[PDB]
Design a protein around this ligand. Structure first.
Ligand code: 97X
Ligand code: MTA
Lengths: 625, 305
């Protein structure tokens, strides 16, 4: 199912028009709330005293219909940025009048054009309207992929069209939108209605709108091609853009008259439905991760906090993750116990942080298929999960598994371990203090003991996403620093965003750590080449870990463990967006800081522009030891 | 009260044109209220308009009338809000106004329309930034040009060159067209947006244009004279049928003005209380001038020659 609307600039009768639009298959209708030719004076007489009514009556539709079926449109004659002063004054009052009438109707959306570079006064009037009451109405800024002047026909003899490429000039429409929303202070109610043209611009121009709050895509009937049976279709390049937009789940809008007069008008809409049915269904991961797109979550701190029951259930609904663990345990048992010692050598396996025991079962299945004997310890400090482990141990595992309700840093093991297994990793690898926990458990690991995982590495990548910046921005709380939300990471299924560079390794830890002077503090400087123009809002974080030899877990996209639902990426924001030109290098600095009580991250951008140092002294975010 | 003629005429009178014998053609739009549509009217008695009960013929259109013009003596070409250009024709008895064709080719409101010299073709402009040349006989579009970058405000055909016509848009361009050239458009040179165009009737290379600021200018193809006639946008410019013709200018300041050859003011009428939309000179009495506006008034001015 595709949510689509019909754009019209001519509505004789609302009841008749809306009924025809609905019977064609549309969900909503874009129409003007005043007559687009009904120019109205506000200052000079006698035109200002024109008798009413000024427009249609609100009684012509039910309140439910205005709330869900109608999208308002600003009148075309309203030019708040006209160079003529009288035209500005009348446009300012008319824009307030039309906007206020839409809010009066409870309309869910209002369309406003971005058809030129200077919309400064248009932004001021809209910003004034946004701060005049408490409303949730959306404002769709109608902006084209290609400016009209850049797509006009080369039919003016003394004013030809330029043929040389203008890499930045071809991106002028994004600058129109960027400056407008920047003047409007990134208002959550201001979104983009991207208008698709007949000739798509170069991919970089289309990639500009990655991460932008696109809520609607406008497809003129003029761009639809014609097949053999006379039905409107799209070029393969247009189809490519439609599929990317279907992932953003934008609402499509059909504008223009019927240019395929033989076929009925619902032929355009049926083709959008056709393209939508012809795409791969949710592939396991996308079936699990749908609903969490761009949803900010506080990173779990399973050391400082005790995880709830259903949080462990989320961990356990990923068999691919634990079959990797089982395979890592399987290979390790064979490498430590030769065949002649299969019956005499019993390996001491210790699960450090067992939760409800998925690693314990994976260890048991590993020893079975490896045909080796193991003695199992299930260490877990969360006493609520220890209840799950001990009922398991009495009913199934038996004396082979020894449940230990203790912190692995304080537990006095009765013997040393051949293999320690742990799952203490977060989205940023070490952000749950897995190094600190395994360092404290290292003493009861044998001199030749194996730690699974053996090492892990965190990756960072600069991203562009005005929506995620706004989502972070909306996390201000009453009784703390007004900017604290920008100095803490978030676990989030990154969706509407643009990754500005290939991710690069940040922090790495090895276990066991034979080094005599163990220091988990880190300081890493990264330089990210950027081959586009964009606006930096934060850095995405991933991780890779080696369970054993070649068996790995990874959420790093280029090496993402195929079919693994566990772990969304992490997001480190920055207080202020940073403009980045093509060819410039984004240089970020990251510190892993710690004391006896807390561990935290600090980060700063040093190129092309310096940011403030974020989360200094962990004032806004720490990870409890 | 003719047959199939609406009992009530729309308030916003948009266009008024005389034909040879002196009958008055009227175009009206409903720019407010429940229904937004239009109508066409024929008044062989100009002093009876706008009263519907004393009209010669009338008919209703599905949408508003943004602009119209005669096509000969019985043809009526209409620019509809629906994106369609419509052609209506009077029957033999001139008591009905029947629709000839209704073709939806523009993607937005059709704002301006004009008939070329031969009377067999017409050019239209619309808010969809496009300009189309029409074959009135085949009821098809011959050419669709996209030279402008904003909405087209006005298109005016050359009086005697069937391939030449003017156009102005809110992209600040005034384009001289000639379909005989491989690139038919040619720009004529910072000022304010042009809003109205009028060829000179007795000079092939001379025309006048008004801007959004109230200035009427006199232009030749190659080397300017201008006068601030209005305090608001200049809506229309119509030359009189005299040997040395006068120039009637319209504006949203609710005022009519008549200018001589040097753009100097000779007459002034503030009889209208709303916008002044069209003006047409009587062919019978060359000194009489009729204007219409959104105040529903049809004023017959006596212009002192
Ligand atoms: C918010 N957050 N921070 C870390 C985690 C997480 C997720 C998976 C694992 C895991 O699989 N193993 N281990 C750990 C910790 N060591 C682990 C930690 C979550 C989490 C919480 C509930 C969910 C519910 C639905 C969808 C996603 C999640 C996410 C996400 N991603
Ligand atoms: C699988 S999520 C991490 C698991 O390890 C446990 N855990 C984390 N840190 C420690 C620790 N220091 N000692 C014991 N269990 C721990 C958590 O309580 C959870 O069950």
């Amino acid at each position: 199912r595709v949510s689509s609307g019909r754009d019209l600039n001519c509505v004789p009768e609302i009841a008749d028009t809306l009924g025809a639009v609905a019977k064609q298959g549309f969900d909503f209708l874009c129409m003007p709330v005043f007559h687009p030719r009904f120019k109205r004076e506000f200052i000079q007489e006698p035109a200002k005293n024109r008798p009413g009514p000024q427009t249609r009556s609100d009684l012509l539709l039910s309140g439910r219909d205005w709330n869900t079926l109608i999208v308002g449109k600003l009148s075309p004659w309203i030019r708040p940025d006209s160079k003529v002063e009288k035209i500005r004054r009348n446009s300012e009052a008319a824009m307030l009048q039309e906007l206020n009438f839409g809010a009066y109707l409870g309309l869910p959306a209002f369309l406003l054009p971005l058809n030129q570079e200077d919309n400064t006064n248009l932004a001021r009037v809209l910003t004034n309207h946004i701060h005049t009451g408490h409303h949730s109405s959306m404002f769709w800024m109608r902006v084209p992929l290609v400016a009209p002047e850049d797509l006009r026909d080369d039919i003016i003899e003394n004013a030809p069209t330029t043929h040389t490429e203008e890499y930045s000039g071809e991106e002028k429409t994004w600058m129109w939108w960027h400056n407008f929303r920047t003047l409007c202070d990134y208002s959550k109610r201001i979104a983009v209605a991207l208008e698709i043209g007949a000739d798509l611009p170069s991919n970089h121009v289309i990639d500009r709108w990655l991460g932008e709050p696109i809520k609607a895509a406008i497809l003129p009937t003029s761009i639809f091609l014609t097949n053999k049976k006379g039905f409107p279709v799209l070029s393969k390049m247009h189809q490519r853009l439609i599929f990317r937009l279907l992932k953003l789940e934008v609402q499509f809008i059909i504008t223009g008259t019927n240019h395929h007069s033989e076929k009925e008008f619902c032929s355009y809409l049926q083709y959008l439905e056709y393209l939508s049915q012809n795409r791969p269904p949710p592939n396991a991961y996308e079936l699990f991760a749908k609903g969490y797109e761009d949803y900010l979550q506080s990173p779990l701190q399973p050391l400082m906090d005790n995880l709830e029951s259903q949080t462990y259930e989320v961990f356990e609904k990923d068999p691919i993750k634990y079959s990797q663990y089982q395979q890592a345990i399987y290979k390790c048992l064979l490498d430590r116990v030769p065949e002649e010692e299969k019956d005499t050598n019993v390996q001491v396996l210790m699960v450090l942080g067992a939760g409800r025991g998925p690693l314990v079962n994976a260890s048991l299945r590993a020893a079975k298929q490896a045909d080796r004997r193991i003695k199992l310890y299930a260490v877990e400090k969360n006493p609520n999960a220890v209840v799950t482990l001990e009922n398991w141990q009495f009913e199934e595992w038996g004396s082979q598994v020894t449940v230990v309700s203790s912190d692995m840093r304080e537990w006095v093991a009765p013997e040393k371990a051949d293999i320690i297994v742990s799952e203490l990793l977060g989205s940023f690898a070490d952000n749950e203090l897995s190094p600190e926990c395994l360092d404290g458990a290292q003493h009861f690991l044998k001199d030749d003991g194996v730690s699974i995982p053996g090492e892990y590495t965190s990756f960072l990548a600069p991203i562009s996403s005005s929506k995620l910046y706004n989502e972070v921005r909306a996390c201000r709380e009453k009784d703390r620093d007004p900017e604290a939300q920008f100095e803490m990471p978030y676990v989030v299924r990154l969706h509407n965003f643009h990754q500005l560079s290939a991710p690069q390794p940040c922090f790495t830890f090895s276990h066991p750590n034979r080094d005599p002077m163990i220091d988990n503090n880190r300081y890493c400087t990264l330089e990210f080449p950027v081959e586009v123009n964009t606006v930096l809002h934060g850095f995405a974080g991933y991780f890779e870990t080696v369970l054993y030899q070649d068996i790995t877990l990874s959420i790093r996209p280029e090496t993402h463990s195929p079919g693994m639902f566990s772990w969304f990426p992490i997001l480190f924001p920055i207080k202020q967006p940073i403009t980045v030109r093509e060819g410039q290098t984004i240089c970020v600095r990251f510190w892993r800081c710690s004391n006896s009580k807390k561990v935290w991250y600090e980060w700063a951008v040093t190129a092309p522009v310096c940011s403030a140092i974020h989360n200094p002294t962990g004032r806004s975010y720490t990870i409890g030891l | 009260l003719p047959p199939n003629a609406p009992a009530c005429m729309e308030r916003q009178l948009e266009a008024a044109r005389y034909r040879s014998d002196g009958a008055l053609l009227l175009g009206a739009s409903s720019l407010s209220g429940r229904c937004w549509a239009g109508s066409l009217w024929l008044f062989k008695d100009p002093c009876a308009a706008p009263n519907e009960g004393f009209c010669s013929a009338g008919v209703q259109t599905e949408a508003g009338v943004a602009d119209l013009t005669w096509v000969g003596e019985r043809g009526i070409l209409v620019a509809s809000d629906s994106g369609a250009v419509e052609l209506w024709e009077l029957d033999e008895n001139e008591t009905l106004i029947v629709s000839k064709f209704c073709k939806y080719e523009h993607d937005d409101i059709v704002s301006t329309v004009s008939v070329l010299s031969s009377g067999t073709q017409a050019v239209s402009g619309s808010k969809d930034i496009c300009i189309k040349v029409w074959d009135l006989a085949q009821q098809v579009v011959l050419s669709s040009y996209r030279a402008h970058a904003a909405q087209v405000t006005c298109v005016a055909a050359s009086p005697h060159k069937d391939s030449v016509f003017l156009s102005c848009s809110e992209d600040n361009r005034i384009l001289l067209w000639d379909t005989r050239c491989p690139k038919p458009a040619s720009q004529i040179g910072p000022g304010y947006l042009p809003t109205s165009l009028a060829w000179h009737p007795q000079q092939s290379e001379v025309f006048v244009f008004g801007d959004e600021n109230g200035t009427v200018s006199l232009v030749d193809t190659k080397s300017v004279l201008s006068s601030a006639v209005h305090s608001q946008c200049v809506t229309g410019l119509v030359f009189s049928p005299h040997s040395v013709p006068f120039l009637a200018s319209l504006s949203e300041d609710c005022s009519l003005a008549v200018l001589d050859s040097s753009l100097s003011e000779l007459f002034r009428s503030q009889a209208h209380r709303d916008f002044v939309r069209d003006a047409t000179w009587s062919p019978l009495n060359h000194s009489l001038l009729t204007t219409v506006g959104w105040d529903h008034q049809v004023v017959h001015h006596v212009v002192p020659t």
